[PDB]
């Protein structure tokens, strides 16, 4: 199973930005958002995985083959904007880590990131599998560090428990809450996960399809459960480190290493930036591969990979030339990603409730309703954010 490197999206630089900023600025009051977004992601990623197993096709393929041509065109275009926002936080997050490790300007950090992403693009599994394992080592261990630091930091349990009750903290809190949902419920994974499980069967029977669904549901929840524990711990450690005090540039990724200083000591700066670098490079490489697959499913053709790697790279250089804050752009991209979630959910909820698509593996009616409740929740939360951002 070499497809495990796609699991870095739940630990991409977007999660680092939203977790650290959420704790530093709003303390523990956003823990419930991470728990909600992680539970929503378990349901959605199971439906996506069950769609590929039951139907044998990925979600963009089904839209292309079943829905009218103009609707398929609109769905491919909005899927490309999702890939732009997704790759932006991951590519810029890698460039930021280059600056944290070498002091190199953000422009040259992106130049280095570009050459590296172009090099990984045309590599086979022989030279990539050791890199995938090395990335998984840094990110897992930096996640274990937060799981250990969240206990050693002695957090205020009264504020931690209160943080699991849904509450907003002004206008900027809904903005960051929407960003936390997009950082966990990622639209590009909704399309991609259906493609990772398609064509993965051996005897093409119902009993075998039910077997792959059972194994997937246990594997998804086990990994998603660990990712949620890490994300909550990272926000809790960030809250216990910065919130309530007045630390300069609190929440920014250039100072986030201080969250692990009591545990790692003088090594907290390098190990954080190394984990952020491996996270950004692998997610940006997987994201480029995923966008090529999503376009092929929607349109029947695709642009060459070097051209896609080039187009998705321009906004990162534009943002750097604009002098914008990298951590603030990482959050904004996650916010934009959450506005693409309802578009991905509607065909997922419809297709997995169809017998001519799923066969005997039609989704249970209870989980179809929970999915539509999740979709309505995210549509309502995206609308309230757009309401305050436009005024009133
Ligand atoms: C991140 C969330 C994004 C939310 C906003 C979504 C993207 C907005 C722009 C859409 C392009 C216009 C959509 C229409 C697609 C082209 C016009 C069309 O209808 O297709 C042409 C023809 O009918 C088929 O062959
Ligand atoms: C769980 C679905 C995530 C996406 C697919 C990754 C599969 C990971 C499963 C086992 C990892 C051990 C290596 C096999
Ligand atoms: C523990 C946080 C996740 C819970 C499950 C995700 C659902 C998201 C919204 C729940 C509001 C439930 C209403 C409870 C009262 C909220 C306002 C007081
Ligand atoms: C087992 C390996 C252990 C390696 C542990 C160290 C890792 C250093 C990270 C990148 C190398 C580039 C660092 C050189 C860049 C010079 C600019 C700079 O980082 O300045 C900071 C300091 O004042 C002067 O290094
Ligand atoms: C993990 C990868 C870390 C980096 C290792 C690959 C080195 C980057 C290659 C060319 C640099 C492009 C030009 C260098 C930037 C200008 C420096 C002045
Ligand atoms: C394709 C691989 C990249 C090729 C590089 C391989 C190694 C050369 C390293 C440094 C020199 C790079 C050129 C440095 C010249 C910069 C002059 C300048 O004006 O800097 C402005 C800055 O680029 C904002 O526009
Ligand atoms: C403190 C709990 C409230 C925080 C709310 C955020 C959610 C965090 C989720 C799981 C905690 C991680 C626990 C992982 C256990 C590893 C830590 C540990 O074992 O602590 C050893 C230490 O030496 C003993 O003194
Ligand atoms: C089961 C999975 C294990 C994973 C580990 C998850 C860590 C969660 C630990 C603490 C969260 C909330 C505990 C706080 C209990 C309620 C808050 C409190 O301390 O009481 C204050 C009172 O409610 C106000 O007046
Ligand atoms: C799923 C991903 C796997 C990780 C599991 C998440 C860890 C904790 C889950 C339950 C939250 C426990 C805390 C809730 C009990 C305290 C509470 O209810 O908060 C009210 C507060 O005490 C009034 O002020
Ligand atoms: C091999 C296994 C371990 C490999 C990773 C260990 C950490 C590496 C370097 C620590 C940081 C580099 C040394 C920093 C010295 C700079 C200094 O003197 O202080 C900086 C100060 O914080 C600024 O104001
Ligand atoms: C803004 C819209 C995107 C801009 C449009 C592209 C801009 C040109 C960029 C690089 C040169 C093309 C990449 C060079 C690789 C050529 C690939 C190719 O055709 O292969 C021929 C030959 O084998 C090669 O070695
Ligand atoms: C077919 C045509 C393509 C369809 C296009 C659909 C529109 C793009 C959708 C979401 C992007 C939202 C981006 C919001 C930009 C906010 C920028 C910002 O807030 O930053 C301040 C500004 O950059 C000062 O530097
Ligand atoms: C709210 C934002 C998300 C809205 C999803 C956009 C597609 C909605 C309906 C078309 C799907 C039904 C088409 C089925 C046969 C034609
Ligand atoms: C706050 C809202 C979130 C609530 C969180 C509740 C926890 C549910 C999470 C995972 C269970 C599995 C989800 C759906 C798994 C597939 C269900 C199904 O019907 O699949 C049967 C068929 O065999 C295959 O196609
Ligand atoms: C609000 C929940 C409304 C959605 C309820 C879905 C009912 C269902 O069972 O889905 C099959 C139906 O034909 C839809 O495709
Ligand atoms: C948390 C979600 C609460 C679980 C409640 C199940 C959601 C539901 O309503 O499913 C029942 C439906 O009426 C049967 O078709
Ligand atoms: C600002 C706060 C705004 C608060 C409201 C925001 C959500 C409103 C409408 C969502 C409609 C989404 C679709 C829900 C319709 C239920 C459904 O599932 O109908 C499809 C049918 O089941 C297939 O056959
Ligand atoms: C910016 C692209 C807009 C579409 C993005 C989908 C998210 C839902 C958006 C508004 C909810 C409208 C209904 C609630 C009032
Ligand atoms: C009443 C249900 C039928 C609505 C029809 C949907 C139309 C517009 C959305 C109106 C949203 C309804 C209530 C707004 C709740 C909300 O999410 O927004 C909060 C508001 O912007 C500040 O408090
Ligand atoms: Cl708090
Ligand atoms: Mn993510
Ligand atoms: Mn900054």
């Amino acid at each position: 199973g070499p497809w495990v490197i796609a699991s870095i999206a739940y630990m991409d630089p977007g999660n680092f930005a939203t977790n650290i900023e959420g704790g530093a600025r709003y303390g523990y009051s956003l823990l419930w958002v991470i728990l909600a977004a992680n539970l929503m992601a378990m349901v959605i990623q199971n439906l996506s995985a069950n769609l590929g197993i039951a139907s044998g096709r990925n979600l963009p393929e089904l839209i292309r083959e079943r829905w009218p041509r103009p609707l398929v065109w609109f769905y491919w275009i909005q899927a490309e904007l999702v890939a732009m926002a997704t790759d932006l936080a991951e590519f810029l997050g890698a460039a930021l880590a280059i600056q944290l490790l070498t002091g190199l300007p953000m422009f040259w950090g992106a130049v280095v990131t570009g050459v590296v992403t172009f090099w990984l693009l045309n590599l086979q599994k022989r030279g990539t599998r050791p890199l995938e394992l090395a990335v998984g080592a840094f990110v897992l261990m930096i996640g274990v560090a937060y799981l250990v630091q969240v206990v050693l930091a002695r957090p205020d349990l009264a504020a931690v428990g209160a943080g699991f009750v849904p509450r907003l903290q002004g206008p900027g809190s809904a903005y960051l809450a929407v960003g936390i949902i997009g950082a966990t419920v990622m639209p590009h994974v909704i399309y991609l996960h259906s493609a990772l499980t398609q064509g993965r069967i051996q005897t093409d029977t119902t009993e075998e399809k039910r077997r792959l669904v059972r194994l997937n549901r246990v594997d998804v929840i086990a990994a998603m459960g660990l990712a949620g524990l890490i994300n909550m711990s990272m926000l809790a450690v960030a809250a216990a480190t910065f919130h309530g005090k007045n630390v300069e540039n609190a929440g920014d990724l250039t100072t986030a290493y201080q969250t692990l200083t009591p545990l790692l000591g003088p090594a907290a700066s390098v190990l954080f930036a190394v984990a952020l670098l491996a996270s950004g490079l692998s997610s940006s490489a997987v994201g480029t591969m995923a966008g090529d697959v999503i376009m092929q499913g929607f349109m029947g053709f695709h642009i060459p990979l070097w051209l896609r790697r080039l187009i998705t790279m321009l906004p990162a250089f534009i943002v750097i030339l604009l002098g914008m804050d990298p951590s603030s752009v990482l959050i904004l991209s996650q916010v934009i990603l959450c506005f693409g979630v309802p578009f991905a959910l509607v065909p997922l909820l419809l297709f997995t409730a169809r017998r001519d698509v799923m066969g005997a593996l039609v989704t249970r009616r209870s989980f179809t309703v929970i999915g539509w409740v999740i979709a309505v929740i995210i549509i309502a939360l995206n609308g309230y954010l757009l309401w305050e951002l436009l005024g009133g």
Side-chain angles (χ1 to χ4, degrees), residues 29-124 127-187:
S29 69
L30 297 184
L31 277 167
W32 68 273
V33 191
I34 307 186
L35 186 55
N38 194 91
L39 291 181
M40 295 173 174
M42 288 186 180
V43 182
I44 295 176
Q45 293 303 323
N46 281 157
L47 294 187
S48 174
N50 297 340
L51 184 58
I53 297 177
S55 68
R57 319 298 161 187
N58 56 68
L59 182 60
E61 278 175 336
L62 289 167
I63 292 179
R64 174 191 62 192
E65 300 296 331
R66 306 178 63 81
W67 282 4
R69 180 188 179 101
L71 187 50
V72 184
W73 221 276
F74 158 78
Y75 257 91
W76 161 68
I77 291 182
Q78 63 91 28
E80 293 292 350
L81 302 174
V82 164
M84 297 283 296
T86 306
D87 182 65
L88 182 56
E90 305 168 338
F91 187 94
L92 218 66
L96 181 64
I98 297 295
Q99 175 187 260
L100 298 180
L101 290 169
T102 61
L104 208 59
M106 275 294 299
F107 175 83
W108 290 114
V111 170
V112 172
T113 304
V115 173
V116 172
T117 51
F118 270 104
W119 173 71
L120 298 159
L121 194 59
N122 65 334
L123 285 186
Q124 300 179 356
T128 311
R129 176 68 187 279
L131 282 167
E132 300 173 15
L133 285 179
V135 169
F138 294 135
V139 175
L140 172 73
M141 293 302 174
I142 212 64
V144 172
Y146 280 106
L147 295 175
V148 168
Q149 186 66 88
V150 72
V151 170
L152 294 175
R154 286 180 43 87
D156 192 77
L157 288 175
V160 170
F164 288 100
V165 178
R167 288 180 58 189
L168 289 187
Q169 309 287 312
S173 60
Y175 175 86
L176 194 48
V178 165
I180 291 180
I181 299 186
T184 300
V185 185
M186 312 193 73

Side-chain angles (χ1 to χ4, degrees), residues 1 4 7 193 196 200 216 219-220:
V4 315
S7 334
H193 206 154
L196 305 185
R200 211 168 61 174
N216 169 85
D219 274 5
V220 165

Side-chain angles (χ1 to χ4, degrees), residues 262-326:
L263 186 65
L264 309 174
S269 179
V270 171
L271 298 183
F272 182 89
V274 164
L276 185 57
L277 178 55
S279 172
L281 290 180
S282 54
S283 59
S284 182
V286 170
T288 299
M289 297 297 190
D292 178 67
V293 171
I294 297 177
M295 177 184 184
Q296 179 65 30
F298 275 124
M299 301 286 96
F301 67 98
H302 66 272
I303 68 173
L305 271 179
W306 65 264
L307 179 56
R308 172 172 297 268
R309 174 71 280 184
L310 215 46
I311 298 174
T312 67
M313 200 168 66
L314 301 182
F317 283 88
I318 296 179
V319 164
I320 294 177
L321 295 182
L322 285 176
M324 303 180 63
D325 181 59

Side-chain angles (χ1 to χ4, degrees), residues 39 364-370 373:
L39 291 181
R364 195 176 318 279
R365 192 180 225 91
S366 303
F367 289 107
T368 299
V369 177
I370 296 180
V373 170

